[PDB]
Design a protein around this ligand. Structure first.
Ligand SMILES: Nc1ncnc2c1ncn2[C@@H]1O[C@H](COP(=O)(O)OP(=O)(O)OP(=O)(O)O)[C@@H](O)[C@H]1O
Ligand SMILES: Nc1ncnc2c1ncn2[C@@H]1O[C@H](COP(=O)(O)OP(=O)(O)OP(=O)(O)O)[C@@H](O)[C@H]1O
Lengths: 721, 721
């Protein structure tokens, strides 16, 4: 038999939810997805279509707080057995009521309902046409909304939250006096949800505020009393080996600090990546491993949590070798996988960007498409008017228009750019900060950038970049010329100081076709097979063009040579005269790392976070699922972490200290990241109502007028409308 | 139209309940009678068949605590209009959730359910086969049980009460650790009730005790926390006249203290009988009155309660002249009504004795019928063996067998009687207490009576009687001879002291045909048309036999004369020589009051009460409805108030102080009665398992084995059986 629902499972892309009922899988009806009984356990399978057509599986089992020891054992058993039937390629997750993963929560954008009861109490997710209902839902959460069934009583209430008194044909949404308007909008989505999905749109949602409680409400609840107020270093992990059956657990430390070596993961063994400080652990299953310790990976994860005195509700993932997720992969130094040089996409595609249509860059049609803008980091073609300045002292000093495109590493600059994307106009201010610029000048450039923003109305995008990690759009501001970055001194008055005798330049290109030439230390083990290089030497000048390189960096490298007043010696990779090598002081290992080009997004999917400087305390909460304009709360500071770049979207009604610390908050986020990632990553401050295309292009249903009418008033004009 | 439910109304004996729904009468389904929404109002019509065949109506409107001002106005409007359609002869009642009259509560023996919600909240008494249910009922009350729907939460709970977690197919009765076993038996009746009446017997009642909470319960409620403890001169009234439309209320005091004169009630006017101290008022509607102030009697009652600052939930009855109830009639001096000399029964028949078959007395068949025994106060024919004793000092002294039947008012006696009723055997101890007996001797007789009880095993009935108010059974212990009671001195040694020259004797008969001759003051205004009298005078002796008198008192009076050693002069009433009248010292008003004979029970229906000497505090709570053995809690002291007599039934497991104060408790009850009733009323202490026929005869389904198996264990062996 093997299990009849196993044959229904994982056949097409979609989401499938079974509830565990007396050691059987019973399908939850699709219209009630997101409903979960508190005394039950469930299995959830999400099937994603990978770009190469092959299928992807995330298996979760979810455990209610009032769950039996038996019902949850069955959920695990089925999870393991379903993974087995899916040929052991599924990523597995243990999810616990109130504490479930960002992936899981993303499946349910209308939110979760935690219901009272379960199988043992006789309740099911089914309901006779004519159903009588009398329940109270307490709605909690900004980013991830959770409606919990509570006792039908004023004792469940407070003056901070929203509540829904569900009377069947009539749904009564009540919102506390201290309730914020964003939370109301959310409670509204939930109310709408009950009406549309239970009920079949055959119900009247009316909505009220504390003090104006209606007849129906006061009838079932009695007189309203005085109500109470509502109730209100995670970067370090360790890696471990593990050899057991299920009882005699052998746990040996392999790496004491992240970032970890990818080579520490070996196919014979199994490891636990202990990120338990931040509420998460992973079990990695080597592809040879041992069938009995692969199959007991959940039990092993359990034993580890017990042995370490981490909470029960600690999240758990088990990934098989080759089926790793970004979250997992982030903890390692330089993840690579030889099979994925060629192919469409990668072996995993994060659910929240699975629906995103990939659009390749096309200068001709860029004005036509915010999606393209977003995916290649280009707010426009780069041909708009611009002022470039150098910071000297406490002043902006016009750079000589002849040198536009040349940036010196002893300086910090500010650029003012006007952008046109037909659809949208605006301004970007780039603050380029030299790696050798004095601290006072760097800092000065930042304050001056911030001041220019203020004098210009508050509207312009504000982007900090650091030498070497130039964003796509800044590289392309110079016609077809490359952005030249010298490692050396300055370009002021008699800042003077001439050349180093021997200089190397790496010439890297972007999606847009633009190039930057960065001056680097002239060594052999800094050569890169994907770029053009230029080696200026007292003798002559070499134009090394690598195997993986293209026309764009060839042409960009020789346009640098004109500026350097030298003449090239074309030379393909590997067949190079050894005056070349003697100029570098030897000959060493390479980089032949063919770049994650189109696959950038797959390896490092964009992620949306909320940001808080509340009570001298820095917290980030991920908003899960597909990106939505509605999640951008007008009183919040948000972070859109493309990998290339970190946008910080600042809401009009956010606190003034918070939106002044926008750049600092983005840095904290970047410095705090478990991936131990490039501290030079560009940060881009964007303001509500004045978002650039490369930001809005990540949000499918972006609406320019969305805030033109207060979003809550619109939502309400559909429920009583 | 007049109202289609009006035509369905009051046609046959029975109970009808409509719920008020948007100014309409909608019938509650009969299986849910006793269910009432807390935010609704209802109309309840109880039709009783009077013994003459004519119909009787009690109209209640019931107001939930969460009731609208509009829904309750409609209830009143319908009540008044329904009374009008029933030709104005209904008795009317304003009933309020939690505070409803003894009559009303008597209609619902399984108890009442107060439900959350109502019409405005969308809830109805109907329910789709397949209905999902999840509710909590808190069960409260000993005599009148009330299950209230409460929030589904441990916060609703306490360690004292019983609760029912109704999950639909499974009903979970929980009983606190401090919950007494009688209360559990009741909670069980409610649980059974839900199973049988909702659900159609298609549900599993399981029952539990605090500490043993089952999976289903803990699943919907969460882990059980520490639970809290459960939460724990009314004889004086005044009469008032009242002349108004509905606003300008004129209220004039007519009588300052009860007992009231019946003549104070006059047909032109309306009165309020203010017993608001005890939670009750009455409006009496004169039969000429004035149609507009008759029809606004409820609104008048309202205005009175406001003007007097009595609680809203104060009970209200409006009775029409001639349609008065016992509760009402009790407040007056000597209620009479000329039309009811002849006829079958009276104009009102209290609902709780409406089903009682009247069995007239028949010596031949008395051993055959406990009903007869009860209704005439005869535990048997009276021919059993008996010892009579006189109390002299601290001793019982055998009375001379020749004088048996002669009792002297300067003595107190005790009689030990053995009774046989085929069905039942037992013993009665009568303690007769002379009106002229010294206090020490009276008291002595009581202690000696109590001691004889104890020495005889605890089993015998124990009956205190006072000279003049002899019970039926004691009169009939003397063959066909009358019970002679002298007002004078004693019958001991040389207690001696001879006659008064002129002596009168009243000779009254009972149902059984037995007579007592009582010596009274020889006056004309003590003559009574229903009795035989005997007037001994130095000259000769008169046998006055009244018009209303019968053979029984004739014969009884002349058997007294033989004992008095005199010879009679027969003389019918009205035609009497005036040597007769000169012996009495004149000639005055009579009594021609033809006795309430068969109608005794109608005028003064028996009533069952629980009794408590708890915290130096004397409380009586009426157990309403038809009399049930099940209501006789084995740990309680109860009072069965026949009018003639007050039984006090003492439960085996009642406290020792309480059952020693049994007689005193009965007296307190009698002295406390608003009727200001005869303080000489015989009190009869009866013990659990050893109840006499004249007690058990009032209980239709009396079962001798009922306590042979603990009643709770039996009830439980039907729910899980
Ligand atoms: N198959 C993959 N799965 C997960 N991560 C990958 C994969 N391939 C490359 N990466 C990681 O993500 C980054 C992308 O590799 P890529 O070659 O595109 O970066 P790079 O060109 O070496 O340097 P840069 O970060 O400046 O682009 C690297 O840090 C690499 O370790
Ligand atoms: N129609 C009636 N309705 C209500 N009470 C009545 C009615 N008739 C008589 N009674 C009351 O109840 C008692 C019964 O009247 P009845 O003539 O039977 O008593 P009695 O013979 O005068 O004295 P006793 O109480 O000793 O029998 C009286 O107190 C009387 O006021």
């Amino acid at each position: 038999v093997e299990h009849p629902e196993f044959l229904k499972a994982g056949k097409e892309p979609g989401l499938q939810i079974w509830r565990v009922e007396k050691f059987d899988l019973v399908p939850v009806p699709p219209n009630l997805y997101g409903d979960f009984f508190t005394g039950d356990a469930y299995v959830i399978l999400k099937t994603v279509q990978l770009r190469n057509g092959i299928l992807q599986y995330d298996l979760h089992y979810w455990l209610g707080n009032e769950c039996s020891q038996d019902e949850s054992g069955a959920a695990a058993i089925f999870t393991v057995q379903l993974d087995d039937y899916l040929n052991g390629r599924a990523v597995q997750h243990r999810e616990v009521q109130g504490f479930e993963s960002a992936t899981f929560l993303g499946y349910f954008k209308s939110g979760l309902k935690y219901k009272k009861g379960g199988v043992a109490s006789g309740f099911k997710h089914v309901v006779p046409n004519e159903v009588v209902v009398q329940r109270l839902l307490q709605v909690k959460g900004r980013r991830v909304v959770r409606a919990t069934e509570v006792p039908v009583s004023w004792e469940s209430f407070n003056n901070g939250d929203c509540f829904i008194l569900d009377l069947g044909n009539n749904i009564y949404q009540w919102c506390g006096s201290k309730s914020n308007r964003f939370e109301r909008l959310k409670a509204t989505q939930v109310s709408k949800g009950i009406r549309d999905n239970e009920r079949s749109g055959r119900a009247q949602v009316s909505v009220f505020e504390e003090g104006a409680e209606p007849e129906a409400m006061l009838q079932v609840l009695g007189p309203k009393p005085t109500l109470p107020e509502a109730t209100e270093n995670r970067k370090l992990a360790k890696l471990y080996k593990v050899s057991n059956g299920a009882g005699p657990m052998v746990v040996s430390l392999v790496a004491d600090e992240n970032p970890f070596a990818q080579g520490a993961l070996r196919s014979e063994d199994c490891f636990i990546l202990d990120h338990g400080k931040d509420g998460k652990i992973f079990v990695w299953k080597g592809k040879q491993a041992n069938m009995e310790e692969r199959k007991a990976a959940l039990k092993t994860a359990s034993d580890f949590i017990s042995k370490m005195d981490y909470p029960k509700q600690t999240q758990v993932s088990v990934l098989p070798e080759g089926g790793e997720t970004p979250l997992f992969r982030q903890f390692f130094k330089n993840w690579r996988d030889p099979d994925q040089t060629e192919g469409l996409g990668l072996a995993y595609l994060s659910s929240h960007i699975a629906h995103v249509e990939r659009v390749p860059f096309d200068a001709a049609t860029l004005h036509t498409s915010t999606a393209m803008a977003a995916q290649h980091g280009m707010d426009d073609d780069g041909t708009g008017q611009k002022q470039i300045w150098r910071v000297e002292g406490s002043n902006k000093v016009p750079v000589d228009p002849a040198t536009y495109g040349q940036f010196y590493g002893g300086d910090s600059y500010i650029i003012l750019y006007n952008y046109r994307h037909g659809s949208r106009q605006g301004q970007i201010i780039y603050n380029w900060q030299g790696a050798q610029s004095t601290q006072d000048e760097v800092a000065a450039s930042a304050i001056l950038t911030a001041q220019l923003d203020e004098e210009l109305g508050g509207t312009p995008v504000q982007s900090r970049v650091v030498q070497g990690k130039e964003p796509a759009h800044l590289m392309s501001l110079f016609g077809g010329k490359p952005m030249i970055v010298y490692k050396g001194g300055t370009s002021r008055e008699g800042g003077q100081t001439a050349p180093a005798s021997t200089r190397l330049f790496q010439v890297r290109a972007s999606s847009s076709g633009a190039t930057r030439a960065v001056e680097i230390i002239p060594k052999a083990g800094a050569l890169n097979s994907n770029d053009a290089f230029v080696l200026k030497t007292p003798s002559a000048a070499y134009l090394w063009v690598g195997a993986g390189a293209s026309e764009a960096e060839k042409t960009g490298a020789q346009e640098l040579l004109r500026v350097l007043r030298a003449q090239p010696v074309q030379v393909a990779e590997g067949s190079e005269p050894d005056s070349f090598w003697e100029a570098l002081g030897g000959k060493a290992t390479y980089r032949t790392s063919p770049r994650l080009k189109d696959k950038k997004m797959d390896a490092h999917p964009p992620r949306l976070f909320a940001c808080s400087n509340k009570i001298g305390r820095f917290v980030i909460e991920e908003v899960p699922g597909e990106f939505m304009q509605e999640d951008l709360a007008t009183d919040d500071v948000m972070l859109l972490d493309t990998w290339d770049q970190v946008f910080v979207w600042v809401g009009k009604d956010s606190q003034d200290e918070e939106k002044t610390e926008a750049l600092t908050s983005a840095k904290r986020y970047i410095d705090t990241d478990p991936a131990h990632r490039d501290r030079r990553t560009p940060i881009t401050v964007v303001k509500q109502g004045f978002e650039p295309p490369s930001f809005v292009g990540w949000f499918l249903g972006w609406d320019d007028s969305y805030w033109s009418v207060d979003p809550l008033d619109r939502a309400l004009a559909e429920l009583a409308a």
